[PDB]
Each structure stands twice: as C-alpha cells, then as structure tokens.
C-alpha cells in the first residue's frame with residue numbers, strides 16, 4: 802500500500818509514508834516536533850467526539866472549560882486548503898524472489914470523500930468482496946473472483 | 951512491351967502515399983507502447 806501510494810501519487814504529499822523517512826526520524830527536533838503540534842493541532846481543525854452514557858450538555862461544557870486559547874487574527878480561524886495531488890498511472894515493482902509469496906495492488910484514482918458515487922463504488926466492491934484461504938464457503942462463495950480463486 | 955506501365959506508376963504513387971502515412975502511424979504506436987520500457991527506471995536497493 803505504501804509503495805502503491807508512492808507511485809499512485811508520486812511527487813505529491815500523498816506519496817509519503819505516515820511514518821516518515823528514516824533520515825527525518827533520525828534528525829527531527831524538539832523544534833519541528835513542536836511546530837507540528839503548534840501549526841497543526843488547532844481547534845477548528847479538531848472534533849471532540851463522544852458516545853456512551855453521556856449528555857451532550859455536560860460534555861460540551863467540560864470542553865468549553867479546557868478547550869481555551871481564543872484566536873486573535875482571522876488566520877487562526879481559516880481552515881487551510883491543501884494543494885491537490887496528481888494521480889499517475891504507473892507502477893513500482895519491488896522484486897525479491899526470496900519472498901515466500903507476492904503481493905499485488907492495483908488501483909485507479911478515486912472521487913474523494915464528498916462525491917456520492919463513493920457509495921456505489923462500495924456497493925461494487927461488495928460484489929467482488931474479499932477472500933483468504935480460511936473462508937469456509939470456498940467453492941460456493943458468491944464473489945466470482947473468490948470462487949475462481 | 952508493358953501496357954500496364956501507366957497504371958503501374960499510378961499505383962506506385964498511391965502506394966507511396968499510403969505507405970508513408972501508415973509507416974508514420976505505426977512508428978508512433980510502436981514508440982508509444984515501448985515508451986513504458988525506454989522511460990523505465992530501476993534501482994538496486996539491498997537490505998544491508
């Protein structure tokens with residue numbers, strides 16, 4: 802999946818590992834670590850979520866109590882829009898014949914959270930479904946790709 | 951000696967035209983497809 806991303810997007814933010822480079826991890830600093838939290842963990846860009854035996858009220862309050870630090874300017878109120886990433890039909894092949902099995906990931910550019918079709922696309926994925934050697938249905942499963950597999 | 955003469959040259963023309971155009975086209979498609987390889991890049995990244 803990582804490699805998939807790294808070529809699917811290549812030269813874009815999305816083509817980066819969430820764990821970061823080996824170098825970065827080696828040299829990141831008290832500084833930059835600060836900066837991230839600093840620049841990134843900001844109120845508008847956050848959602849306090851809860852579910853269980855709790856009343857919205859009670860909760861909402863506690864939040865009003867600790868989620869202080871009020872924003873002065875207007876920049877601190879502005880949700881930064883991200884520069885979009887270029888999809889690129891391509892491939893990356895990491896060969897190691899010493900690897901027991903092989904993995905293969907194929908994909909196409911998606912529509913994005915918003916777009917409704919994401920629903921359809923899912924309904925689709927539901928038809929091709931999924932499979933591992935332990936499913937019991939085996940040869941009787943409904944996913945054509947499964948059965949054949 | 952060669953009644954055809956004319957018609958044969960008239961053909962040569964047609965043949966040269968189709969020819970030139972169809973070779974060009976094919977050449978694109980050949981390159982196009984082959985691009986994938988000629989553009990290819992590889993690296994040797996062992997585990998060290």
Ligand SMILES: CCCCCCCCO[C@@H]1O[C@H](CO)[C@@H](O)[C@H](O)[C@H]1O
Pocket residue numbers: 957960961964965968969
């Ligand atoms: C590389 C492939 C080249 C094919 C060229 C096709 C040329 C055939 O063209 C011929 O020309 C004659 C003269 O007018 C006509 O009489 C024939 O009917 C016609 O078929």
